[model samples]
Each structure stands twice: as structure tokens, then as C-alpha cells.
Target: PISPIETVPVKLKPGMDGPKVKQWPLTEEKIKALVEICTEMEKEGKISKIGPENPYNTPVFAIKKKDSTKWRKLVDFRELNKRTQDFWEVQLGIPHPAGLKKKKSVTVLDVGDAYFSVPLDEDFRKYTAFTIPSINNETPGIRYQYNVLPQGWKGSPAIFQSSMTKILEPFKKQNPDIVIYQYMDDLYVGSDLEIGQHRTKIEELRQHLLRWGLTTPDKKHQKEPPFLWMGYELHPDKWTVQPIVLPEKDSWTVNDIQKLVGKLNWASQIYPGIKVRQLSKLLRGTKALTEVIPLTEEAELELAENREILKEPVHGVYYDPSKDLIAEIQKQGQGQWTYQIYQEPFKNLKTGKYARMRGAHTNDVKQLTEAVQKITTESIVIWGKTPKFKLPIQKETWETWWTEYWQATWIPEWEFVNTPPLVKLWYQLEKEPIVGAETFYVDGAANRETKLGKAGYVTNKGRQKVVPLTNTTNQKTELQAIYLALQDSGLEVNIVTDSQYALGIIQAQPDKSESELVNQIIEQLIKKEKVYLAWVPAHKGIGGNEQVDKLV
Candidate 1:
């Protein structure tokens, strides 16, 4: 039998160093189990002793087998993945549940210890070295590494898929009727053939598996009907495909939002006809999830809304943004695509037609709008903001923006971007030096029990009371302080503070709130109430900055 293919050398992201080995502690029973598995693997030529000079290490974990009282060994290579850079070259051919559409009969097969069977090159093997706990009292703990592809490696799936693709190349070419699908460790054979002919195709594939030295456990193979593939059900009797019956998800805990997003992405794809945007709301601001965001009542409500998408029999393909929008999208290059969701009416320059423009994709339309306004306020102001903030840039405004943007480029001599004629003394000219300049200092600090805490700014005039702020963050506090300062006095004030963060947030204009605050400040300036937000060095013993610090 031919040995399975070796995984290509794992590369870390540029400037990233691989994990240095950290010793892991194991309980007595776990240690014994590890020793037993390691012993058997070594006998099967799967692992060997590594020299002490190895610079890499990863943790080994024991996960409970599903529906059974057994444990399986799993190596955690997440640290290595962290150090690894993105792999853009190889697009891994991962199987999707939607791919099982319209298949009649199915034969499912599992590859036992899928990554374990594939060989690892000797040069790259040492980086996977890990120290194992001793089973016997007499035997000291030893350093060992796998000779086969370890499952936990981030690039394992892609490499394995490449190898498997090569293995099946000949079979795929010769037998056109045999439909094969593989998802991670599981392989399925589907056919429109009768039962007898389907059995023959399964046997042929089973022979190929044997030749490749891939194990096919009798219990794991499904040689009958009611075939399931990747959370999808395929029935020959009904001649239909449906997402497999799945239990409704419990509330998402803060810790596993990452896992929840993964599941949701997969779930949203399989159960079609549901708009992908609708189900994606539960994952709002997922990227901003640094520590924890508790599943608040508002969040749970959003989750419930998304969950309702799963409660029925829906039939359609996965939402393809490229397809429906391709007519318009084909004209616009990929770089021009904006997912800003805010809606506004606009005139299309090309056809001189009126159209509404807004958010295009399913994410936080609010977040995208903020992101867009942050970088450039001209687009939103020109296009207009939406009522519900759906769609980033509408079709009409997008065409207008694109048309005007590219127009000057086409007519080369029409505009001068770099060489602008300067008015005499324009750089240093400052005409007005009017009075009413009051300084407002602000600061915020927080603890678990008392959050969104802030200090009221004091000036020569008087003190202003901070309001009952049910919603508060350090960011919110700073904005609120500025808001209160603006609301209380109509004076031309020079805002003084030590928060570069707050000042940057206002100046950056990354969202609607930031844009709105900046706009308000501008409005006040236009109203003869001039304002300038300045960031001084923090912790300075200066009077005004120190006063707010002391107050907080």
C-alpha cells in the first residue's frame, strides 16, 4: 500500500516566530492514555524521539469521543498558527453542505485519524516536537514528535486536500458518473445510479482508499440510504436535499462568540432562501469583541431574529452577492465595492436617473457607515445617510461617485492634484483673535461596580452637572463631557484635556457618532462659539488637566 502524502512545510507569517515548547501537565489517567497512544503510534512508525535542540512545542489535549466513553488525543497548534501568516496562495477546497444538492444515493466513509495517516517530512517534523508525560514510574518524560501530519496545524487541511485531490485525480477522470465529496476527515460517494451500480462504485472507491493506505472503519462507513453530509440530509426515497435536523442553539456565552460565528456562517449557508444579511446580525461588532460582551437582552433578541431563519423548510442556493450584483459589479472593479449601508437618494450621472443608494452587504451597517465617514466625510454627505442605515453606498450614488472620481483621471489636464497654486501668505494667515476662550477639562475612569465614570469640567464661569448616563464607556464619557460642555455654554471655548485617545476619536471621524460630534462642534463654531480640542501630555501636574484627573 502507498503511504499518504506528506504535508508541505508550515510557514509562519513573516516576522512571526514559532512557539517555543511549554511543558504541559497531565493527570494520571490522561498521562497513561497519552503513553498508550504514543506507544502504539511509535510502533506504527507514526512518531519518534526528538533531540533537545528543537525550538518548537505545542500542547496535547484529550477530547471525549462523541457518544462513547473514550478519549482521543489532539495536539493544539494554535500558538504556531498565531505565529503563522495568512496563506493566500492556496485556496483550500473545503466541502460545503450546499454542494450535496441534487445527489440521489450516497455512501459515506470516514478516514480514521485523518491527519495521522499522512506522512510529515523529517526536516519539518521537529518543529512539532512536544514533551509527553511518563506512564511508568521508572520511565522519565521524553520529548517526541509526530512523523505524520498533525491535525491541529492550521495548514493541515489545505495540504491534505491537495494530496487527496492528487490521489483522486485518475478516478475522477475515468469514472464520470461517480460523485465524490470530502469534508475534512469524512468522504462521501454519491451517484444517480441504481442500488446495484452504486454499490459497485463504492467498492471501487473503497479499493482506492485501500491502495492509498487510508483506513475505512466498518462502523464509520454508511453503505445505505438516508445519507448525511456536512449537516445536510440527502434522501433517495424523497429525491430531495435538506439541512439535517438540528436542535436550536442555546444562548451564546461571551467566551465562544468565535465558535458561534463559525457555526452561524456554516448554518446560514446550508439552510437557503434566508437572506445571509438577516442571520448575520447576531455577529454584529464581532471583530470588536476583545474581552467579552455579555449576551444582553438586545443581543439575544437579535439572535432570536436570526434563529427564526432556521425554523422552516427553505430551498435555494447560498446567497451569492457576486451573482445578483454582477451586472452592476462587472462594470465596477473589485476595489470600488463599498459595504456602507446607510441609504440616501441620489441622481445617476450616466443615465440621469434618480435612485436610492445605501448599504450593500450584511454586517453592521452602522459600523460600516461609521468606518466610511471616519475616513471620508465627503462620500456620506454627498450620497446622504439612510433611515435604517441599510446599504453602504446605493447604486445611484455609487455610479455618481465612480463617474465623477474617474472623470478627471480620464481627462488628464483637467485637474491638478499635486501642484495647487498657493495664495500669498495662506499658510501662516490667521485673521481673527476674538475673546470668550474658556478651557474645559475632562477625564474618565471606571471599575466593575461603577462604569462610565467621568469628571465634570470646571471653568471661570461655573460647574455643569453631568447627566444620568445609562449607556457609558470611556469613549462615551469623553464624548458626553464634550457634549455637556457644548450644551451648557455658548462661548468660544478651547477644550483642554490629556486624552489623546478621546481627541483622536473625535478627529478621526470613523463613525456617525464621531462625525456627528465633529459636525456639532463645527455647528457651534459657525454659531460664533469657536472650539478647539487639544491633547496635552497626560499625568502632567498642570492645573486644569490635574483638576479633572483629581475629580475623576
Candidate 2:
């Protein structure tokens, strides 16, 4: 038996408070039977006696055997059950049988009395102690505890699942080719090899089971058959798993609704499309052990439809060959099969960015179709505009397209076109006046502490505006006046500034540390190459400077 502490943990809810002990009065017949069974169990080391007056003692009773004179011992684990946590399992999500190509072979292994085989933790054994009759019943009978998992314990299923998963690890590793889908004790092993070829895998698994003290009853040592797990049949002869008949509304208890909902969720994976939310009403206000609201007739009808969906194969190709062979279903309709030949390290022509389009193939139209159909309807989005459909016009057309496409993507060949930044003006400004040349004067006024400046410029063409500054220096303010005048400046014109610092900056060699306004002025200067930066001393008597100064 595996150590219960580390292997199959059974922790009672924390606190000194525990379930109140309920006692069953011992009769003469009950005492004799309990003593006999207790003695036999103790002899086999399946149970050991605890103290008669242990605080954790629970009541034990006997139920008469069918067509037999003897009685079988049973623990009323109700109080203990209340203290245990409920945990269960997940489906392996095997896809529709029809969609998957027939496997070479399939086998099912059922662990006999699965929960009973799981041993209880030694520490927890004391917590499970139950009172049974002592030899004569004058004194209180001894408290006997189970060494293995006993039926009716709330946590038995989850405990068994965890430990059994560990137990099957070696067999899984030994048979790597086999796809093992385990739903607790029932393991469905699938392989795309003939039964003769993989029988050795089964024999080896059987050997491991025997060594681990597990029995496979129900034909007990039954070998291999194509299977389904969790009441859903996964027969290899046909593709999809057998149809699941949903429970009628009248039969559903609170627990049934929760379990059914869980099953439907798992089915959604392999079963392809199910609008699970359609049946959500049945599960609302329901729980495993709490309130159960029965499904309405319409809800029941919806589940039956959900069950029918499981019969259809999943629409996508299973890309992972290791876990399952490529899952491809039969084509439903004849839509125009269109494709693009893509290469890795490719450029998205529209985005002008290098990207990956690796593993794209034109020959596998079926796989591509399934990929497109797999996305949900609401989220089914295709990037960018609708593209023109391309088909082979001729053999050379495909060859030429592919050759050039490859060259453009992976081996882009090109001649030099070394474009440099336009820092210097493209054309020289003539010193003589041009027809479009116009005169302009710029000036700035600012408060030092407020760091707020008002700057403006006047053009010969009657254009004038004021600009406000925030968190700016005097040099920036002077630059902004020039920037504003340049906003409407001509191809060949002059900017007469009162500040020589502004003129010096315009003629200064460009570097990375230049202010943003200075960069804009440079770019505009490059565009209006005929622009000339002339300067006059501030407060100097000049007519254009005086007008601009008054405006500032």
C-alpha cells in the first residue's frame, strides 16, 4: 500500500472542532459478527484497533447479506463526509471518432473496484476510527480503522485518481507510441499500429498491473478493444464516439446537473461546436451537493441537441502528430480553394515589416480549410482588405511567381539607393530678389520667472499671428517666432530677426541635441531652400523690426 500521508492525502478541515460522534447500539448478533470480522481483518493487517474511548470514534453497523446468514460491516462516514473536500476529474478531450482516422488498435483497461484499491493514509486512519462490539459487549467494543479506502468516503474518488495516475506513469513511459486517455480507473490506450504489433505493450501493462496488485475485473484480465472513456464510447471501427443520451429533466438531481454540465464541457473539446451557454439555465442555482433545479423541456431539448453534436468530427486538422495523428474531416462543401505561397523571413508587403509565414503549404487545402473554419463566428476575423484571388495561369506563371516571391522574401537582391537625411537645403538661395520672394520680420517677448513668452511675426503679404510659450527659454521663444513666420514662408524669402542667436542657430551645423522647433525650422528650410536668415540688433531702429516688435 502506498503511504497515505504523501501518496493519498486525507486532510480533515483544520481546527480542533470535529464532527459529533453518532453511535449505533450493538445487539448480540451484531457484536458476534463485528468481533468475527474485526478479528479476521486485524489478522490480515487490513485494520488495527484504536482506543475504545477515542474522541474521534464513529458508529459502525452491519447489513444482512443477500441470501446469506452473515452480516457485512459498514461505517456511517456521514459526519466525516461533511468534513472532507470534494474534488473530481477532467476529460482527455478525445475528438470525434469519425474525424480521426482509424487507429491500428485500441484497448480499454478498467481498474477493478478502483476506489477500494487506494490505501488510506496512516495518519488519517485514526480519524476514521469507528466503534464495533467487543467480544461480549459488557465493556465498550474496540474502535477499528480501515487501512485502505472504504466506500462512502467523500474524497475516495479524487484520492484514487491522484495515486492511480502515478501508478500508470511507468506504463505510459514504456509505451510512448500509445495515446493513453485516462478517466480515472478506465484507461483507453490508442495506437495506429496493428494489434499484433502492439500486443507486447498490453502484456507489459498487464504485468505492471499485476505487480502493483491491481485487478482488471469485468472479464477481469480483459485484453484490448477499441474504447470510449467516461461512458462515452470511442469505438475505432467508426470515426465519431457514440452518441451521448442526455438525462431527462425529471431524473436530474442537483448533483446530476453539475456532473452533466462538467461532461458537456469536456464533450465540447472533442465534440467540436456546442453552445454550452444554451444549456446554462439547467445548471444555474445548482451544485454537486446543493440545490438542483431541473431543466425545462426546452433546456432538455437543447442538451439532446448538444449530445448530437458530439457525433460530428471536429472540423480542424490535429497538427500535433505526436499526441494524435493529423485529424482531418471530410469536406462538406466545394468552396473556391485559394492559397498563397509564403516563405519564412518574409515581408508583409502592406505593412512593410519582416515576419514569419513558415510552414504554409498550398497542397494541403483540406488542412487550410479546417484552420479557417475553426475560429468562432464572432471572432472570425481576417486581417486587412479582401485580396484578389490568384490561380495558376500557366506552369511558368507559378514557377516565375514562386522564384520572384522567394527572391523578395529570403534572398532580396537589390542595387544601391542610399537615401540620406535632407539636412542641407536642396537648392541655393539667390542673393538677388526672386518674383515669389517676400520680406518678413520676427520678434519675441518673454517673462523670465513665468517662463511664458509671447512671440509673433509679420509678413509682407499681411499675415500676422501671436504665439504663447510655456516652460520655454528666450532662445526657444526667438526660435518659435522664426518657426511661425516659416509656417507661411515662401520658396525664396528673407527672415529678419532682432536676435542674432536665432540667425546663428539657422546657420548652425545640425546635430541630435537640437530643439524640436529648430529641427522643424531646418526641415522647412530644406523645403524652402531659398529662405534667407538675416538679423538686426534688438531695439535697433528698423521699420520692419519696429512693426514686429510692437506686435510682440
Candidate 3:
């Protein structure tokens, strides 16, 4: 037998130390050793079934809900049950669903379609027990080829998996702002509220697959939640432990449990009877389960079964900007094309046609209107005591006090930004100016070079400062920026920040706080009244707050 040469790149997961020493393109020594073992096992003809006989194999498990109403539980085919008489093997890589809690729900991620093909190679013929001669270029070695033996007989699974993993390499290297986990067919992607900044990264993923000879995923398959994957459902709030299976309403009544018990009561197949003593270990905590045997109605069972009924979601709807953005994605991306967004009534310059401007994609026209209601507001004049207790004092006002206020007050210290020649500045002191306070404000952004990104730094006034920090890592960079702020200050102070995570690091330091650069700055803020973090909703355009936006 000949061994295939290693054609791929470096070792996968450099520190791997698992069973069978999983590696792509097996070495000649390892292949020869394996061939010798298989030949030896062939001579022996039979082997023991216990663990000592086969230490490498693992126990298999699978759990699926027999009834949607109740949570899925593992089937305990123990001495208490008589239906199964033989052991079976489960394919590797499929989730065992073991971590699911009692009565909790889950969504099984499923691919919309699978691509498969029988081997058309000659070397594979050795694994077949038999093959017919070509009658008219239409037989096994000729045309109508049949598997005739176990498929993926030896290392086929490993080889195929390696190829798939290679196809996914670029996505891993791109380092998306969010964490993305892929388990075989399953994919879990999420992040903190800065998720909007990370949302654009998925395009790279979509494009990479297309270039790698894989089928383009149907756009219909992408959804926010309640998406069907692998015969399971995922909910909008992924933080919930189990992927909440849809229609979580339970339909199993007490009477149904009784019928199951009756059906088992008459079964003669079980050795003796399925009793507590026979499967006590397997039935642990499943005391809630009862067996019911259905009575014969013309020898056919009309047994009752469990069902789940779901209530309609009463919560208000949310804005999903991705779907809107996706609708504008081109079929063949240039890899350099940037995303552009504009509210309607605005015209596109190319064809001089109206832009496909939408605030958010929604089926209801009411929501569509709610999505763009804010475009009406413009410049205003404020009068009365201060920020809160104010009114637009003048009729048809042209004054916006903040632009003028910044041009006069803070602009002189700024380096690279100039106040736009036409400025609208409006302000009344809302509260006394904050002084001697260690205020570390940190916000992370991405894709600054493209039009799709709404990004930049505060240039003393509201203008963005041109700097090298534009492409920094998301939360990591935000924290470091806060650290930068603290290092520049000198005071015994209270640090006020809007980020919950940076605030957490400032207050209760964690064991895994490993970034030296970020940590050094954070430690400085700790010397003050501590960084007090209060979550404030950003960019709502409230009167005194409008100018706080960094015009990036």
C-alpha cells in the first residue's frame, strides 16, 4: 500500500495532544503501523466488547424530544427497556446535546442542503468486496459504480474534514470583531452591543465560501432568530442557555403519561418487566416520567402523545439593520465595494434615481415610517435657564449655539480639525461643568477607510482627529483608549465611562486581565474615586446631547 504525501501547510492547532494523534496526511511510519495492526486484527477475527478491549473508543449519546412540549431527554435503553437488542454507532461530530438542562429548549442547526458524491477514483477499489466488469462502459469499473463496501472506510472522514477546515481558514484569520465558533455544520456568532460594527465582517465569510468552490448560501437561510438549524431552533436572545425550540408550549396532559404506562404494562418483550430496580441509575431524576400502555382498538394503538403550544411574542419589535444591509449586497462582491446608507427622498447620483433608502426592513409600513421619523429635525435656538429647562425660543430659528460655542472655546487646542465654515452651535449649561474628574471615555470602531463605516476620534471639539488608532481592535482598543486617557491626566478623581466592560476591569480586577498596556492605564484610573460606569443610551439627539456626537 502507498501513502499519500502531505500537500497542505503547517501542523493544525500546534499544541494538539489527543487520541489517534489526529494529523492530516499521515506519515509513512504511522500508516505502516496502522496497516500492520489492521492485518493482525483481521487474523484474530474477533475481539472483546468491553472498554479494556478497546480503550480508544468513546461512549456515544444523543437526545431528542419525543414531544415538543417537554424538553428532550436522553433515551435510556437499559435493562428496563426491551426494544433495542443491539448496539449501534453514531457518526462523529454530531452534537450529543448533553449539556441541555431539564425542561430547557434548544435549536438544532441544520444546513439547508448537503453536497456529496461517490468516489470516482481507482485506488478506492481495494476497499470494495466486489466489482463487476464493464459490459458497455456502464458497470462498476466501467459506468454504474456501486459503493459495494463501507464508505469512508479508513481515514476518509479525517481527510474530508481537513479540506472543509481549510476552506474556513480565511474567516478565522480575518479576526472579526466578534467571536465566531463553528462545530461541523453549526455556527455560533455574537458579540456585545457593538455588534453593529462587527456585523459587516460576515460578508467576508460569504464571499470566501463562494471563491472556494462551495455553494452560495441562500440569502433566505440567514435570519435573526427562531432560525431552523439541524432540526432545532435558535431564539433571538442567544444568551438563554438552551436554544429555545419554537412553540415552547407544552401539550402533554396527565392522562397521556398514564396511557404510556398502560402500553408497557402488557408488553411481553421486556425481560421480566421494566421496573425501577432494573434501570434505577438511568431513571435518576426522571421520576417525573411514567410509562403508559395503550389498549387495543382493533389491534391498533390510538395512544395519546405530548404536544407543545406556544404563545405569541408580546414584546415590541426591534430594529435589525443587517437584513436591510444585506438586501443591498451584490451577488458578486468586488471585495472593495463599501456599504452606503441614506434615508429615502434622497437621490442616488449614478442613475439620478431615488436611493433604495430604508431605515430598517419591516413588513409593516408603520414600522417603516417609525424607522425614519427623525430626519425632520434641523437647527434650533434654545432659551430659558440651562440644558434641561429650555425651549426653542425664536421663530424660524437659524441659530445652533454649540458650533459657535466650540469655535470660540475648545478649537484652539485641537491639531488637525477645523470647525466647518458653517457651524450650528446651541447650548445652555445643563449642569455645572465637570472639573478635575478623571473621565475616560472609550468607543471602538471599524472599517474607517470605507464609506460603510461611521468611525473616528473626538478632535477636542466634535470633529474626528486623523490618527493611526482608527483601525484598532474593538473592545480591546476601546479599553486601551480609556487607559490612554487616564495616563494623560494627573488627579485623585472619579473616572466616568459609558462602557460596562472597561468599568468592570477598573472596579473588580479579574484574574485573566492579561493585557499589559491596557492594564497599566486601567490601574492608573483605579487610584481615583474608581471608574464609575453608568450605562447611558448613546446618540438619541436629546437637546443638550446632540453635539456630543463625534462627526466621524
Candidate 4:
């Protein structure tokens, strides 16, 4: 039964008559999709439903014995930490996310449920296949658990989502301006003049959800832009893009290659070439990954081979932990043991005594002999300059050497460095320049009129400041600003600018560098160091300095 509109939440001091606590509902879309599947079965004579009343008001069961073992879900209950429970400060109840918006200010929403409670795995598995069996012309799915059933069982999620969506319908009508979604609970509240307007909406939302059952943890909700709503993370000032997240505490485990892979935007299409290179980071262990779409056969094979590269160093280490530990482990050699179906011919080839005298271990000598015999028998050997190989080659020409050595020489050093902005502000003052003549000038901008307008904000994040932009022409200001900032951040820096006049000033590399703006920049850049300047073709797609253009 629905609680009365003015019902006071029980204080829970003792024997207070309160409503049975039910789990949160699922989204309407999921319920709709499931309903479609069920209706399809009904049309084909595979199933039937009594009528439109459906499961909203009644329970919807399979009546053919429950079976939800195959369906598992991940739920987070981060707030119910050991500390809160230890002090008996445990709220002893479900704490729902906050949802409120008002006035005219835009809100940022980073949304997702913070918690989910479920039956234990063993409990779910035991009753998975025994769903309510049917007797007449019906099943027993529609009448169970008051429509918010446990998820690990068959057909439970759909019912939950549909019912939950229904409960929120009225609130949606009331807060037509509030943006709620299926993801994390984050909303953007807006108003006529902006800023505080959203705060009013936020409070109203708090009261509304509280009336329905959920409340702010301490009624001390975040009033800043992009407050949490349904399940999305949004920024108050942003409408189209979301800011990147820094890992919170135990989440960042780059020390473990396995953990690093989990955070990457991995893809076979973009990362296939580097698969082999990535193996070096694997101290040990494997990680499985799945994507929205399936990977191709070649991609699967390449990824596997990438793993083998890591397996190389200790391939046989498991054989005997005391020794090379490899012999005890498995490998192929001559006609003895085969890996999959590949032959290990490195079993009998013999090396000359003088060659062995040059400093060869027993395993090395044995391996050399095996290789020689196998190669002689086969009459050919194919090997690429993989990192493991040590044979050096003579250079044929300077031009050819240049081609081989140029390998992505421009890779940004920053991609691998994830230090905080505080610790790294000094990079601008490094005594030894990264590249003798290479210089980079960066700037950030924010909008002033639209919510998307630009501004410069200094953050403790790795990137010191964020600046947003409104148009192409104004970007010239950003370029100038970056040049100016580079000068001031304490480095002798070179800058490229879009302003023809600005370019003219920097091109001269003036001795005194006396123009007001240029002098100010020089003083800043020279405080800890010498600055340089140059111009790059605009919009030509160079990955360097151009990143600043987009940042604004």
C-alpha cells in the first residue's frame, strides 16, 4: 500500500509501525524491453497473459518454476562501510541518492546507484530452476514480491524497473525542468537568472523524494553544479560533455598492470598494433575484456599473442622454483614435448667449444645447439627484431637509420605521467629543457554568456586549469593567453600564436622583449628560465599545442 502523502518517517526508536522497506525499482525502458520479449512469446502461442493489468498491480511469475541463476548483477553499497556499522551509527535503513533542481541554473549529473542488496549466490542458485509452475492457462510470475522482486531470479528486474518508473512519474510531472536518467542519479536544475535558482529546485526535489521515501543523507546535499540525481555524473556548467574522473582512493592500482587495463579505453581497432608493446607492463597475470561489439578473429589471435610476450621471461620458471624452474614446467624440445602442435627442435644442436667458452650457461648452450640443429634441418630461420632479440645490425645509410629511429618520436610525455598539478607546476621550470628548441604553450578558456562559455580555473588536478571557448576567432585570444601564461609560469619558452601581430612580435625573438604583454610573458618565462617563440599552421591537426585549442 502507498504511504500517505503527509506520513512522517518513523524514528525507529522501538516498536513503531512502519511500512515494509522495499528495494528501489528498475528503469522503464528495461521493463519495456522485457515486456516486448514476453509479448512476442504470447503472440507465437508460446505464452499468455491475463490482460493489460499486467504485473504493475499484481505479481508476474513464470508459473513454470523459477530460474534466475544465469542472471547476476553487480550492486554497490559503499555507504554501509565498516566504520558506520561499528559505531552503531548505522542508519539501519536504505539510504537513497538525492534528486532536486530549481531556479534557472544548469546542473551537472554524475549518475549511478550507490547501493544494491541481493540474495547470496548460493541462495539464488538453489531456487533458480524452480519458478512457480503453471496449472490452467496461466503462469505464476505476476503476483510475487509486490513487483520489486529479487534480481538473480528470472523476470524480476523488468517488473521492478516498470514499477519504479511508475512511482517517479508524478515527480517528473512536477519537476518538468529537472533532468533525470537511467544512469547514476545526477540532475541539472535551472532557473531564470541562473546559479541559485537550481538550489531552490534541489531542495524541492529533496522534499519530493523524501515524501516518496528517499532523503538527503544529512539534508546537506551538494549545491554545486551537476548534483547527483538518478545515476549520471554531470557538471552544472556543461551540457554535452562530462569531466574526466580521478580515481578515488583504492581504485587506482596502476602498480598492477591488470588494474591499469581495466581503466583504459581498450579496443582492438586502435590498440592492436601496440598489443605486443603492452605486454612489457604485465608483471604477471591475465585480464579478460568484453566490448559492446564482438572482436574479429584476427584481433582475438593478436591479443593472445600479446599475452605470450609477457609469458616469455618466465615461460619455464614454473618447472622448478629452485632452479630455472623451467624444466619442471612445460616446453617443447626435439621430438620429446610439443606445445600445442609446435615442435621444439632446440634439443640436440651442438655449439662449438670456442663459442661455448665465450661465456655460455648450460641452458644457453643447450638452447644454441637445439636451434642450430633445427635451423639446419629446416634450412631456414625467420626472425624479426622483437625486443627480446639482441643481434645488432649494421646501418646501411643515414636516411634509412633516420626512418627506423623516428618511431613516434613525438609521443607526449604527459600521457604516461599522472602526477598532480601541485607537484608538476615546476615542470615549467625544468633546468634542462625537454627538447633543446621544442617549446609548448598551453591556455584554457571558459564561456561567459552561455553555460558552455569559457573561463580559467586552477585545479589540483594534473591539468592546472580548464578554459572553455565559444568560437573559432576567439581561440586566437586563448593562444595569446597560453603564450602569456607560459612566459609567466617561469620558463624561457617559445610560443606560436594565431594573431599575425602576435606572431610578428615572437618571430623577432627580441633582445629586450619589451612590449607590455610580451615583456610580462618574458619576465615570467625567464624568472626560472629562457623562453622561445614560433607559429604553427592552425587547424592542420598537429597533436601538440592544438590540444590547448580544444581545451578552451
**Most TM-score-accurate candidate:** 1
lDDT of 4 by residue, 88-156 (tens): 222232222111222345543322121111112222121112111133344343212111122332322
lDDT of 4: 0.32
Quantify all predictions' global Cα lDDT against the true fold: 0.52, 0.56, 0.29, 0.32
**Each model's total of backbone clashes:** 23, 9, 31, 93
Q: Candidate 2 or 3, higher lDDT?
A: 2
TM-score result, candidate 4:
0.22
lDDT, residue 163, model 1:
73
Which residue ranges in model 4 land beyond 4 Å of their true spot?
1-160, 170-176, 182-195, 203-233, 238-255, 266-552
Q: Give the TM-score of candidate 2.
A: 0.43
| Reference-based TM-score, model 3 | 0.24
TM-score for each of the candidates: 0.46, 0.43, 0.24, 0.22
Comparison by TM-score, 2 against 3, better one:
2
- Model 1 misplacement above 4 A: 1-18, 24-26, 51-55, 63-69, 84-102, 135-140, 221-232, 235-552
Model 2, 166-249: lDDT tens per residue?
A: 777877786677776556557667787677866677767766766665556435644444343334454554322334545655
Tell me the tens digit of each residue's lDDT in model 3 across 198-231: 4445555555555543333434544545645443
Global CA lDDT of candidate 1, please? 0.52
